[PDB]
Task: inverse folding
């Protein structure tokens, strides 16, 4: 989703069984607007 | 001498993020473009000023 005119992200984005850091390509400014829990779960899935 | 002086590691460390949050390299008043610059496959924006 890089380059889009997105101002917010869905709070249900974290409900993806198979999605890693590489699977989402977005600019970092709008990558933090989502709740911290789903971001931290995504990072937890990035261990291996 | 520009290629030897501007090694790949120095440009890699000099890589920055632009407003659109992507890798950008700024070359200002350099005598030319080092050949090590074109080894930065991760570069997305190339800025050349007064070359």
Result:
């Amino acid at each position: 989703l890089r380059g889009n005119r997105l101002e917010c992200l869905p709070v249900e984005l974290g409900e993806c069984p198979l999605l890693k850091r590489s699977g989402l390509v977005v600019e970092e400014d709008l990558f933090s607007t989502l709740p911290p829990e789903v971001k931290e779960r995504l990072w937890r899935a990035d261990k291996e | 001498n520009l290629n030897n002086e501007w090694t790949l590691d120095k440009l890699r460390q000099r890589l920055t993020k632009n407003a659109q949050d992507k890798l950008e390299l700024h070359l200002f008043m350099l005598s030319g473009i080092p050949d090590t610059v074109f080894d930065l496959v991760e570069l997305e924006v190339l800025k050349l000023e007064l070359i």
Q: What stands out?
A: The interface with chain B takes residues 2-3, 27-29 of chain A (CB under 8 Å).
